[PDB]
Amino acid sequence: ARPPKVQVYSRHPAENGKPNYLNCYVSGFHPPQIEIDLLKNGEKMNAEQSDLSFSKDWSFYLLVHTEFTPNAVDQYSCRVKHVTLDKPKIVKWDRDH
Amino acid sequence: GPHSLRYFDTAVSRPDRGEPRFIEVGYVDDTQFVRFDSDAPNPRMEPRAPWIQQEGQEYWDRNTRNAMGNAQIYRGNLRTALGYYNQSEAGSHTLQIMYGCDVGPDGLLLRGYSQDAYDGADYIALNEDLRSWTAADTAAQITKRKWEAANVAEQWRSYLQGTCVEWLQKYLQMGKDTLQRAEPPKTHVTRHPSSDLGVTLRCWALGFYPKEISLTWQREGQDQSQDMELVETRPSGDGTFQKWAALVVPPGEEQSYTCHVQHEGLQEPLTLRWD
Amino acid sequence: MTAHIVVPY
Numbered sequence: 001a002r003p004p005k006v007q008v009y010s011r012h013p014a015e016n017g018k019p020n021y022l023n024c025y026v027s028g029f030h031p032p033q034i035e036i037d038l039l040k041n042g043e044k045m046n047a048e049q050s051d052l053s054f055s056k057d058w059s060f061y062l063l064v065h066t067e068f069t070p071n072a073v074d075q076y077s078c079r080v081k082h083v084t085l086d087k088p089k090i091v092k093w094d095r096d097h
Numbered sequence: 098g099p100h101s102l103r104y105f106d107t108a109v110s111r112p113d114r115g116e117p118r119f120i121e122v123g124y125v126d127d128t129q130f131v132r133f134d135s136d137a138p139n140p141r142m143e144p145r146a147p148w149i150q151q152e153g154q155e156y157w158d159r160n161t162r163n164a165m166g167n168a169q170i171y172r173g174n175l176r177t178a179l180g181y182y183n184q185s186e187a188g189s190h191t192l193q194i195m196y197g198c199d200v201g202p203d204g205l206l207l208r209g210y211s212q213d214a215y216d217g218a219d220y221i222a223l224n225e226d227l228r229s230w231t232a233a234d235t236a237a238q239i240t241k242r243k244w245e246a247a248n249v250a251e252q253w254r255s256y257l258q259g260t261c262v263e264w265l266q267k268y269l270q271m272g273k274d275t276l277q278r279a280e281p282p283k284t285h286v287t288r289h290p291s292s293d294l295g296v297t298l299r300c301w302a303l304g305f306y307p308k309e310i311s312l313t314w315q316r317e318g319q320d321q322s323q324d325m326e327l328v329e330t331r332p333s334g335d336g337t338f339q340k341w342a343a344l345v346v347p348p349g350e351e352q353s354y355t356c357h358v359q360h361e362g363l364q365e366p367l368t369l370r371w372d
Numbered sequence: 373m374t375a376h377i378v379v380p381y
Contacts (some may be wrong), residue, residue: 159373162376163374171381249379252378253375253377335374
């Protein structure tokens with residue numbers, strides 16, 4: 001058993017009003033069951049999830065992604081539920097990370 | 098450079114379901130190209146890249162028979178793995194298998210793999226010489242004994258030296274435009290000051306392929322470390338990758354530091370500074 | 373191409 005590591009980021013650098021993609025990359029975890037959700041102002045978004053894969057150390061990885069058009073005030077995050085976590089893990093989108 | 102063909106196989110005992118779910122993904126280098134999931138009612142090997150779709154029916158039928166094949170083996174190995182550890186029927190368990198060939202710039206086999214992990218931990222693995230097995234504990238050491246008499250090592254060796262390598266070449270031919278592109282990073286540096294305490298410079302690389310890249314910060318020849326944050330390389334979602342390296346520097350000195358970017362798709366190394 | 377191997381365990 002092993003907790004997930006979570007990064008949230010856009011595909012291209014964010015320019016407000018410009019079509020783009022939002023990504024949540026989750027990795028390092030065991031066992032494989034995990035719930036991952038992309039959030040728009042605390043709201044679940046529709047998004048696709050990659051086919052489960054792993055790395056040489058056996059730990060799992062997945063990419064969750066959806067289209068979005070940046071901001072104004074719109075806040076975005078990724079939310080992850082995993083057995084190793086007693087509490088869900090919310091990582092906030094920040095355009096320069 | 099060198100290339101690889103790799104399959105990543107995950108079997109998960111549910112166990113509030115008659116069968117465990119088997120998932121397989123196939124990669125050339127860092128690009129996924131096939132998928133098998135046991136939870137389809139039709140379960141077949143499927144394409145996950147446009148350039149494999151030209152394969153005809155017999156390719157898909159053979160792959161599907163083999164994944165059907167290996168799913169029933171791994172299910173068997175799940176049941177076997179309980180008793181070799183005195184284990185509870187309640188709890189869910191994971192079996193992972195990685196196998197594939199790694200090949201040099203001239204097509205020689207460098208490393209072949211077949212290796213297994215039960216709930217995240219080594220279990221058994223084919224050695225670099227493809228003629229022997231290292232078993233992680235006493236449980237696996239019996240599986241080894243069985244694989245030794247069976248000469249399954251010779252079955253893997255023959256696959257890894259013929260099939261695996263010949264198919265890798267084929268895939269590199271068919272997917273040429275994708276898999277042999279040298280696609281360079283698009284780069285820029287940001288600056289974020291913090292009061293009168295010095296300044297986070299962040300050097301970015303976006304849209305590159307393959308995955309391998311070097312981002313370092315230098316001052317006066319020397320690589321920097323102290324408030325140096327380097328993220329894990331990460332998929333962009335379109336086949337390309339991104340990464341960044343951030344450094345805290347003193348106020349006023351922004352231009353003494355330079356980001357050094359090394360990638361396969363660059364004519365020569367690149368040197369960036371903030372302006 | 374995937375591998376067709378084979379043994380019980």
